[PDB]
Design an enzyme around this catalytic site. Structure first.
Site, PDB file in Angstrom:
ATOM      1  N   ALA A   9      10.498  51.226  15.561  1.00 56.21           N
ATOM      2  CA  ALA A   9      10.282  50.322  14.354  1.00 56.21           C
ATOM      3  C   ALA A   9       9.056  50.735  13.489  1.00 56.21           C
ATOM      4  O   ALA A   9       8.388  51.873  13.795  1.00 56.21           O
ATOM      5  CB  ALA A   9      10.048  48.867  14.748  1.00 56.21           C
ATOM      6  N   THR A  10       8.930  50.329  12.299  1.00 59.53           N
ATOM      7  CA  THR A  10       8.153  50.729  11.282  1.00 59.53           C
ATOM      8  C   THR A  10       7.673  49.551  10.330  1.00 59.53           C
ATOM      9  O   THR A  10       8.261  48.492  10.472  1.00 59.53           O
ATOM     10  CB  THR A  10       8.477  51.932  10.408  1.00 59.53           C
ATOM     11  OG1 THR A  10       7.521  52.811  10.186  1.00 59.53           O
ATOM     12  CG2 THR A  10       9.182  51.753   9.023  1.00 59.53           C
ATOM     13  N   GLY A  27       4.352  47.883   7.347  1.00 57.47           N
ATOM     14  CA  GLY A  27       3.128  47.966   6.389  1.00 57.47           C
ATOM     15  C   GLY A  27       1.837  47.933   7.448  1.00 57.47           C
ATOM     16  O   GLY A  27       0.993  48.651   7.145  1.00 57.47           O
ATOM     17  N   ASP A  45       4.972  34.223  10.025  1.00 56.48           N
ATOM     18  CA  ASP A  45       5.868  35.194   9.114  1.00 56.48           C
ATOM     19  C   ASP A  45       7.243  34.979   9.995  1.00 56.48           C
ATOM     20  O   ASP A  45       7.927  36.268  10.202  1.00 56.48           O
ATOM     21  CB  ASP A  45       5.107  36.672   9.500  1.00 56.48           C
ATOM     22  CG  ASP A  45       5.907  37.684   8.540  1.00 56.48           C
ATOM     23  OD1 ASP A  45       6.603  36.993   7.532  1.00 56.48           O
ATOM     24  OD2 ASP A  45       5.871  38.841   8.654  1.00 56.48           O
TER      25      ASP A  45
END
Lengths: 276, 276
Positions: free
Chosen positions: A18-19, A21, A134
């Site tokens: 995963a990636t 900010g 979030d």
């Protein structure tokens, strides 16, 4: 920061999975216990900020003391030789946003189940003083057996960003933001509820309730725009459950994960959504 | 016995909605409360048998004191001018056998959910001293929202039939019979568990585990035949959960609805089936 690196001599990186900010998430092996895990490796711009790390750790720490099938485990924090990281459960599941890329909507039955599962998972957190802040499909993993696992409690919002209304910018997406959050108020359990209502709105009807070119565009609609009526073919009780979740005043919603989940159960059971 | 008949001056028959060995089920209006309901009108051969009615009422009575989303309500018994009847919840759902006529199998996720729901519903009953004794897809109603409702606790097996092994005959189907029942032992909560395992076997894999031309044929396989291995593509934990449920010795199964449901939850959650 790559394959074969062994963070603090313990955690060996295998694959980039995963990636985002704040950093990247990697599949690793814990070599002390010989267990596969997920490691969020923070970007230098966050690793190097004392105060951000303090807030980041405060959230993660609390999540690590919660044991529940619907909360993805948080195992440990460390720094290695400069580079901050968080060691997590490696969840064998597919993010809800991924699922929907194919199906458009979920089946009504699956949607309610997911919503109710997510609501129970949030409630454990809410009972501990912990707000997710979030909630969004990319944080709702679904396994082959239908177990929902919730990732990244608290941590994204530890960056202490100013109001989106004023900055026009958000770390990640504004598509599920609670109106009070978009205003700069700190999230409450009722904010998570709202954002789960958006997820719910999306999941049942096919599409998110608000879209727009950029964070500011969408966030403003959350503050100001009544959501578009859901499809008339949906049971009214289901529509009404979701409409309640999306009221602008947090004080008028289901106040936390448990009351929401209970309301999803009443609706699954053919009853009208309970009084929030 | 037809449209417009008003049983005991209270319950007005509207439409014939189910049928079977023991009688017929009709949609009616309760005219004292102006509520739509289901009425099982018993055949004369059962209405006229004092002792069968006593056992029938003993079961129904107990079910009527259970309040749970997964138990179809039992509201009342009466006799009208000769003709015995039972007043029930009118469930807006589709029998599981109906569902499968289309889909062949259920999705793995839906299957586990259904199994777990059914197991919780049975457990309330089991905690009250009540055994279902005729668990099968036609007694598992599924509503548009995914709520499972369980019909006809106890009552079918109030006919006090001799062993199928000896008679070669069963009221209804032998396709889900527990081996000990097929032998003439009285059902226990573990019998319901077994029969829910059959339902489970069917629901996941596409087809029932045992078929045959006639009650005796199938019932014998329940007593004597190890079930055919489930499809290798199914998670082993799921396969293993079902295999446990289908052991021949009732004393070696999950003993009641709650332990089974818990085992379904552990499996949904990625854990291997717990020790029965």
């Amino acid at each position: 920061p790559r394959v074969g690196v062994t963070l603090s001599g313990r955690y060996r990186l295998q694959r980039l999975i995963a990636t985002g900010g704040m950093g990247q998430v990697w599949e690793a092996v814990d070599n002390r216990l010989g267990r596969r895990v997920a490691v969020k490796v923070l970007k230098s711009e966050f690793s190097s900020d004392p105060e951000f790390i303090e807030r980041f750790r405060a959230e993660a720490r609390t999540t690590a003391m919660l044991n529940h099938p619907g909360i993805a485990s948080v195992h440990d924090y460390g720094e290695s030789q400069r580079t901050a990281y968080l060691v997590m459960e490696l969840v064998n599941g597919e993010p809800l946003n991924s699922v929907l890329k194919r199906t458009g909507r979920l089946s009504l039955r699956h949607a309610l189940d997911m919503l109710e599962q997510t609501g129970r998972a949030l409630q454990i957190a809410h009972a501990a003083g912990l707000v997710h802040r979030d909630v969004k499909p990319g944080n709702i993993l679904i396994t082959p057996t239908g177990q929902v696992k919730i990732t990244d409690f608290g941590i994204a919002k530890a960056v202490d960003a100013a109001p989106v209304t004023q900055t026009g910018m958000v770390m990640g997406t504004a598509q599920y933001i609670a109106p009070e959050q978009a205003l700069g108020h700190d999230a409450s359990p009722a904010s998570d509820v709202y954002s789960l209502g958006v997820v719910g709105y999306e999941a049942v009807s096919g599409k998110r309730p608000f879209a727009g070119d950029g964070a500011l565009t969408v966030a403003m609609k959350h503050i100001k725009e009544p959501p578009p009526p859901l499809p008339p073919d949906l049971p009214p009780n289901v529509r009404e459950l979701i409409e309640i979740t999306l009221v602008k005043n947090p004080a008028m919603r289901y106040r936390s994960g448990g009351p929401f989940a209970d309301a999803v159960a009443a609706v699954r059971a053919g009853r009208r959504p309970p009084r929030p």
